[PDB]
Amino acid sequence: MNIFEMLRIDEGLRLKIYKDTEGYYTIGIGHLLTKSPSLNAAKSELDKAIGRNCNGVITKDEAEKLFNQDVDAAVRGILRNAKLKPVYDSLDAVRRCALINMVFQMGETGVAGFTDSLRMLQQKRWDEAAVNLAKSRWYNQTPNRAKRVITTFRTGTWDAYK
Ligand SMILES: [Cl-]
Ligand SMILES: [Cl-]
């Protein structure tokens, strides 16, 4: 199991503009297009992003291209983040995937907001961190996906995804 396969399981793949769980316009593998309520604004962002007139639909390849960019951006953002970098450096490879997953979903700033959870992960207090992570809007809104990520941090294995 690797980061790409983990996120593909958590986000799914759709080739036509859809609304994410928060009601925002998205496409492919969790690629947010716009927070705007306008389908048209979504369509324009989508075309800007692909370099073609897509009229709200893309190919598998295009979706995978966007996915490669987004995972790269997520990893590079963690490494530039003064609060995220130290945690990431302190983790094992599986747990590292779990933090990349949160960042892809919530953005760098959102994850950096989990102060106490971050401190506990860096200290390797697995069980404590899992309990604190669950006390969040994130957990209440997408509980199945959150539990999966949380189990990953808690155990250090890919069990939740197997
Ligand atoms: Cl809560
Ligand atoms: Cl969920």
| Cα–ligand 2 centroid distance for 146 (angstroms) | 7
- Side-chain-side CA neighbours of 47 within 13 Å: the count stands at 11
| Cα–ligand 2 centroid distance for 4 (angstroms) | 18
Return the CATH fold of 1-162.
Lysozyme (1.10.530)
Resolution limit in angstroms? 1.9
2 is in an annotated binding site: no
104 is in an annotated binding site: yes
What are the DSSP calls for 42-63, one per residue? HHHHHHHHHTS--TTB--HHHH
Are the C-beta atoms of 84 and 103 separated by less than 8 Å? yes
Which DSSP category does 159 fall into?
G
Q: So where are the chain's domains?
A: 1-162
Cα 4 off chain centre by: 11
Determine phi and psi for 82, rounding to 5 degrees: -70, -20
Which active-site residues does the annotation give?
Answer: 11, 20
